[PDB]
């Protein structure tokens, strides 16, 4: 039974799980885009979002600095968090990362995902795009919308 168990069992135990997630998050902060097994990226994505919130507290908040010191194993990334990543998201309340599934890994056929911090300088991922508003179905719905708006104003 695992009702309401929100965390995965990975690595060699609870501590190793955190270390595994921390190394992934450190890679993400440096490179701003990484690929890893889908389950591990999904697990880490929550931490990557919350790290930005701590970064927004500022480098003078001692609690934020301690959190960043633990989670960033390469200390040159701590200035980047407080001075680059957190200011970039100053005008957002969330949704700092995007996660997309990529083809299965070659060796072990593991399900894979790419995760990146939005607003990076890297070439854009081939994001999925919704159908054009000019398609047959979308035009028929646009007509229905136009018709409903005209009847309400009357």
Partner RNA sequence: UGUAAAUUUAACUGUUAGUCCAAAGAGGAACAGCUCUUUGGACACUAGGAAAAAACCUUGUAGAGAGAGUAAAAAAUUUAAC
Partner RNA sequence: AACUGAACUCCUCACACCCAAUUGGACCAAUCUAUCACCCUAUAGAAGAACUAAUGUUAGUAUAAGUAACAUGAAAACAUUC
Partner RNA sequence: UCUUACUUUUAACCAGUGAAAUUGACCUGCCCGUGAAGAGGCGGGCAUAACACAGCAAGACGAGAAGACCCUAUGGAGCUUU
Partner RNA sequence: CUCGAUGUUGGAUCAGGACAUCCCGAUGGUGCAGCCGCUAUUAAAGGUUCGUUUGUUCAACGAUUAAAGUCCUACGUGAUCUGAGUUCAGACCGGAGUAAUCCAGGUCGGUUUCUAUCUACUUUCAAAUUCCUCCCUGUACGAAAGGACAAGAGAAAUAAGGCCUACUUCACAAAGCGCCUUCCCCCGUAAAUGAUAUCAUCUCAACUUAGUAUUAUACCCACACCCACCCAAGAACAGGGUUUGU
- Binding segment (CB under 7 A) for RNA, from list 47-55, 79-87, 102-110, 131-139: 102-110
For residue 95, state whether it binds other proteins (rule: CB under 8 A): no
Out of 63, 107, 126, 137, point to the residue binding RNA (CB under 7 A).
Answer: 107
Task: Spell 93-111 as b/e; 16+ CB within 10 A means b.
Answer: eeebbeebeeeeeeeeeee
d(Cα 110, Cα 37) in Å, to the nearest integer? 6
Site for RNA in 3-62 (CB under 7 A): 3-6, 9-14, 17, 20, 22-24, 26-27, 31, 34-37, 42
**66 binds, options other proteins, RNA, none, Cβ within 5 to 8 A by partner type:** none
Extended strands (E) in the chain: 33-37, 97-102, 112-117
Are 40 and 24 a contacting pair, CB within 8 Å?
Answer: yes
For residue 118, state whether it binds other proteins (rule: CB under 8 A): no
For residue 108, state whether it binds RNA (rule: CB under 7 A): yes
Are 66 and 18 a contacting pair, CB within 8 Å?
Answer: no
Out of 8, 66, 118, 145, point to the residue binding other proteins (CB under 8 A).
Answer: 145
């Amino acid at each position: 039974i695992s009702h309401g168990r929100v965390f995965r069992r990975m690595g060699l135990g609870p501590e190793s799980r955190i270390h595994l997630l921390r190394n992934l998050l450190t890679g993400l902060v440096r490179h701003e885009r990484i690929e890893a097994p889908w389950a591990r990226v999904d697990e880490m994505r929550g931490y990557a979002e919350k790290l930005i919130d701590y970064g927004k507290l500022g480098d003078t908040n001692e609690r934020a600095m301690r959190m960043a010191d633990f989670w960033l194993t390469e200390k040159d990334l701590i200035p980047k968090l407080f001075q680059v990543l957190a200011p970039r998201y100053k005008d957002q309340t969330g949704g700092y990362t995007r996660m997309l599934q990529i083809p299965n890994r070659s060796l072990d056929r593991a399900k894979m995902a790419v995760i990146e911090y939005k607003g990076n300088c890297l070439p854009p991922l081939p994001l999925p795009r919704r159908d054009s508003h000019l398609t047959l179905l979308n035009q028929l719905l646009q007509g229905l919308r136009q018709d409903l708006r005209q009847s309400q104003e009357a």
